[PDB]
Amino acid sequence: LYAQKSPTTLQRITMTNSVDDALINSTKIYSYFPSVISKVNQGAQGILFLQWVRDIIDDFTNESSQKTTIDKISDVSTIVPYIGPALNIVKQGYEGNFIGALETTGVVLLLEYIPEITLPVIAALSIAESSTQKEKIIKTIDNFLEKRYEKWIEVYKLVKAKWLGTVNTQFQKRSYQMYRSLEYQVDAIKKIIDYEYKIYSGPDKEQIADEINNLKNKLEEKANKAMININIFMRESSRSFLVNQMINEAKKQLLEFDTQSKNILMQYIKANSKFIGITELKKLESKINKVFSTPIPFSYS
């Protein structure tokens, strides 16, 4: 996790890649940008103070702007890999390899709590009609197939609503956690630079005060650009999990609902084939077979 709060004591605080090191020691701030850790801890080369600040900003920029993708997760355009270390999301056997952990686990790795996404078996529809009038039989069939359609629409809404309430919320939390993590980094680096500027006494000290006073603006500009990548990553990851993992589970139960419902309907028709002409039956058979062979695609609002 974000290891608490940068000390207000105005001492020489350094950066660490150990979360434990940061919890125990007040003068140590957890960070997940290695080139920043090195630059900040190393300190300035001689009186080249201005170049030290400028390096910290460049390295902060290169580190926080990093992004990649995974071909098999075709609907996530933006993956920000340092989220793993920022949020202490680690997978056993993938230490230092968040991106490889994500290739094998999937976006589900990002969630604090894996949710259960299996669905109950979806009971086949039934048919009550005992009349033998032809028009009441055709309508009974036409209602059946309309009820069959709705079942797909209903189960989809149900999975989308579970997702909105228990899965999407976890991803959005991750955004807000990264937002606080990145503000923390920006404040820690600002506190270190200011401390070192106070001690600095080089001949350009007055000249460079404007640029050093622009540090927080500059770093927040970079954090905001990283947050744009990160929110896109969380948005695309959340939707990917809904549209694949959670809805594949619905599609699985509904295809089985379909085989059972078709069989219920086939038997109803056969029992009432006295009352319908060979000509009409040739058409219902193939209408039914094609309605049940074309599955209902997922969509939501």
Side-chain angles (χ1 to χ4, degrees):
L1 73 165
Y2 48 76
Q4 293 286 105
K5 274 82 188 174
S6 174
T8 71
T9 70
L10 205 165
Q11 307 183 10
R12 181 41 154 102
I13 47 162
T14 71
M15 282 188 156
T16 184
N17 62 5
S18 166
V19 54
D20 270 4
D21 193 7
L23 292 165
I24 291 172
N25 299 298
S26 303
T27 46
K28 272 143 161 284
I29 295 89
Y30 177 68
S31 183
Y32 41 91
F33 292 149
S35 59
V36 179
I37 291 160
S38 315
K39 193 53 62 170
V40 172
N41 288 342
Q42 162 190 31
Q45 311 279 292
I47 60 165
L48 299 183
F49 189 88
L50 183 55
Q51 284 64 41
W52 179 63
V53 179
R54 277 162 178 194
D55 288 357
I56 295 171
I57 291 175
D58 282 350
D59 292 355
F60 186 87
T61 297
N62 294 322
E63 288 267 18
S64 63
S65 70
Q66 297 262 73
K67 58 185 203 157
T68 180
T69 181
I70 297 165
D71 200 81
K72 71 186 287 191
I73 317 185
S74 70
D75 49 356
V76 181
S77 76
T78 306
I79 291 166
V80 180
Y82 60 82
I83 285 196
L87 300 178
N88 204 16
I89 307 187
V90 297
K91 185 179 180 68
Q92 285 299 103
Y94 289 87
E95 297 79 6
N97 193 33
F98 183 75
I99 194 69
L102 193 63
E103 270 154 49
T104 74
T105 306
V107 302
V108 74
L109 176 71
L110 288 165
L111 301 185
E112 285 187 33
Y113 306 110
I114 302 92
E116 292 182 352
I117 59 151
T118 56
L119 293 172
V121 312
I122 309 176
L125 312 174
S126 190
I127 295 174
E129 172 63 287
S130 301
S131 168
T132 80
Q133 329 188 350
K134 178 177 176 179
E135 55 89 20
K136 295 213 297 203
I137 289 175
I138 293 294
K139 179 177 182 293
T140 304
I141 298 173
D142 277 3
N143 294 163
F144 191 88
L145 294 175
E146 281 300 329
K147 286 304 169 219
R148 175 261 176 183
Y149 191 88
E150 293 173 9
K151 185 62 61 170
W152 285 74
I153 297 308
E154 294 183 354
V155 172
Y156 281 171
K157 292 172 69 64
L158 187 138
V159 171
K160 185 262 179 178
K162 276 159 68 84
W163 164 83
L164 187 65
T166 68
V167 173
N168 188 59
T169 54
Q170 290 195 81
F171 282 102
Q172 288 174 338
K173 187 182 177 183
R174 293 314 203 176
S175 288
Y176 171 76
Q177 287 178 304
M178 287 303 322
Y179 170 87
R180 293 296 181 189
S181 179
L182 282 166
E183 293 305 337
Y184 193 68
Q185 295 300 295
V186 169
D187 277 273
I189 299 163
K190 183 188 189 297
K191 284 176 184 148
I192 296 161
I193 285 170
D194 282 344
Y195 174 87
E196 292 292 345
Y197 178 72
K198 188 171 178 181
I199 300 305
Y200 176 70
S201 55
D204 61 345
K205 184 158 173 174
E206 321 307 330
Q207 310 187 270
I208 64 173
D210 282 343
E211 188 169 347
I212 287 88
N213 280 323
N214 201 44
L215 175 60
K216 203 179 229 160
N217 294 323
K218 192 51 60 168
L219 289 180
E220 284 197 325
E221 171 194 326
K222 308 299 185 184
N224 170 73
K225 291 178 178 63
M227 271 319 291
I228 284 168
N229 291 341
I230 282 166
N231 287 328
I232 286 167
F233 179 21
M234 295 301 103
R235 179 178 78 203
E236 288 174 3
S237 287
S238 185
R239 184 180 311 168
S240 171
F241 191 76
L242 158 63
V243 161
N244 301 114
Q245 285 77 10
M246 306 183 55
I247 287 286
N248 285 335
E249 285 301 320
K251 276 168 176 162
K252 183 177 100 203
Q253 299 296 287
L254 292 152
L255 286 162
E256 177 58 27
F257 164 79
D258 264 6
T259 71
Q260 291 310 316
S261 292
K262 194 185 172 215
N263 172 263
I264 294 296
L265 183 56
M266 295 290 83
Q267 296 326 92
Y268 172 77
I269 304 192
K270 292 185 200 174
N272 291 260
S273 66
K274 287 292 290 294
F275 314 97
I276 293 92
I278 178 65
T279 176
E280 204 159 341
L281 296 182
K282 290 194 284 184
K283 306 295 97 176
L284 280 173
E285 185 158 37
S286 63
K287 161 153 107 171
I288 280 158
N289 276 255
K290 264 89 153 175
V291 165
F292 276 101
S293 67
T294 63
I296 294 91
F298 178 61
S299 68
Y300 71 109
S301 77

